[PDB]
Amino acid sequence: MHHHHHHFNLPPGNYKKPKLLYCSNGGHFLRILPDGTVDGTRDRSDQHIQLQLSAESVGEVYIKSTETGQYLAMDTDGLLYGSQTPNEECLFLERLEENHYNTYISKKHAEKNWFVGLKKNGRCKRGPRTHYGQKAILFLPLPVS
Structure with missing residues (x-):
């Protein structure tokens, strides 16, 4: 493994199910819009906030x-x-x-x-x-509906 000059503390969990990625900074779910733009929405029923993470190698997604x-x-x-x-x-x-x-x-x-x-x-x-230190970069992975 290279560590790419960063720590290697990993979060718990797997990539079995899709997730919402919620940022408490402004209270937004990460959203990937069909036109290729990315933003956040507070709308928990938006259909573009459901995300499937997968691991290339350990800790790389x-x-x-x-x-x-x-x-x-x-x-x-x-x-x-x-x-x-x-x-x-x-x-x-x-x-x-x-x-x-x-x-x-x-x-x-x-x-x-x-x-x-x-x-x-x-x-x-x-x-x-x-x-580091910004609320903007802190996400909580949440189960989808």
């Missing part, structure tokens, strides 16, 4: 929309998008944080600590704007 099949990805300038096909920008290091939450670090940009993050207004943060 794909995050896929169950509705559209799109993969969460982060591009070269730190913007989240939904990708039709899996590529190196779709891999995230899923780690435990504060002994409690899940965080997701872009594997491609792991050396810069670019996280998946949702602002209080439900918009995505750009990679460079995310940091």
Whole structure:
């Protein structure tokens, strides 16, 4: 294993069932819209917030929309998008944080600590704007309906 210059505290659980990824920062579920944009919604019955995680190798995940099949990805300038096909920008290091939450670090940009993050207004943060210590990067995985 490479550790990619990060800790290796992992959250409990498996990838058997889909999840909601809930961010208490603004109270949003991570959403991958069919046009490829990514944001958050407070609408718990939205049909684009159900996500299937899968593990490449241990602690490295794909995050896929169950509705559209799109993969969460982060591009070269730190913007989240939904990708039709899996590529190196779709891999995230899923780690435990504060002994409690899940965080997701872009594997491609792991050396810069670019996280998946949702602002209080439900918009995505750009990679460079995310940091340890922010509520924006803290997620709770929740069972779907």
